[PDB]
Design a protein around this ligand. Structure first.
Ligand SMILES: [Ca+2]
Length: 288
């Protein structure tokens, strides 16, 4: 079991959903970290923005995605061709070098739509990439479902009143999370992959239905897989309901509010551009 100073030792025996973290915001950008791997000197939750095309309209290849902030171009990031796969391998390699690590959560913020089969960037192609890179390191929705005695398609509601595995249980694990501006893209992913999904969907959340009902922009069937919720600053009040439902809540854009205050607001993952500057009682990871 690792013991960097930033992790409160009480975290290890706490269910993952009962742990608050400082997360990065867009830490693949050169301006926020010198290398992507260096982010793991400070936090255990990272973020990658990924594009199908080299710009908005051209330059994609099968089984490949780019990492950059703007529509464009190409790859513009601090990973070790520094594409999505390369960025993911930086995490995989850090994980191999730190047996016993606190579970790593990677927010995969998708910037374009899914392709059809011919172009090699479907939900299935995405799952195949992340599985090829991480292999057995992943902890997936079905793994959580089995832990709580639920079908994966009923995580949404069956998580209420339940504990995730503890950080100790999740030593050495990687959790992948899908974001997009449009919940439709998450619904498409879940409809394609169902219980085989390698990635947790985390919809944009601005009402109770996005936690526990038919999520805005999604089918009822896809809604049932929701075990995580994504909130901008204006919607962070919903983190208390994510918490109530044992969904992992992430709040982005709220940098002028301290980690301690976010803990009090029941936010699991508080995303900061300046992640190293944040702490509470010397810690960046602690139980609520
Ligand atoms: Ca992002």
């Amino acid at each position: 079991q690792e013991s960097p100073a930033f992790i409160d030792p009480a975290s290890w025996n706490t269910p993952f959903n009962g742990i608050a973290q400082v997360a990065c915001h867009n830490c693949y950008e050169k301006q926020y970290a010198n290398t992507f791997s260096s982010v793991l000197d400070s936090v255990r939750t990272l973020e990658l923005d990924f594009w199908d095309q080299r710009d908005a309209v051209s330059g994609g290849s099968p089984h490949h995605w780019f990492v950059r902030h703007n529509p464009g171009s190409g790859n513009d990031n601090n990973c070790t061709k520094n594409d999505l796969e390369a960025c993911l391998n930086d995490v995989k390699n850090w994980s191999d070098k730190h047996p016993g690590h606190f579970p790593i959560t990677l927010i995969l913020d998708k910037k374009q739509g899914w392709s059809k089969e011919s172009s090699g960037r479907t939900p299935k192609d995405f799952d195949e990439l992340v599985a090829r890179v991480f292999q057995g390191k992943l902890f997936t929705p079905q793994d959580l479902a089995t832990h709580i005695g639920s079908g994966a398609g009923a995580l949404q509601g069956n998580l209420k009143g339940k504990s995730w595995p503890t950080a100790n249980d999740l030593q050495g694990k990687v959790l992948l999370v899908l974001n997009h501006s449009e919940n439709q893209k998450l619904s498409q992913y879940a409809e394609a992959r169902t219980s085989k999904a390698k990635v947790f969907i985390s919809p944009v959340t601005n009402g109770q239905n996005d936690i526990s009902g038919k999520v805005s922009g999604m089918s009822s069937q896809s809604s049932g897989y929701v075990a995580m919720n994504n909130m901008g600053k204006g919607d962070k009040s919903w983190a208390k309901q994510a918490f109530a439902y044992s969904h992992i809540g992430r709040v982005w854009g709220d940098d002028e509010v301290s980690f301690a205050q976010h803990i009090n607001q029941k936010i699991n993952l508080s995303a900061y551009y300046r992640f190293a500057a944040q702490s509470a009682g010397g810690y960046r990871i602690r139980p609520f």
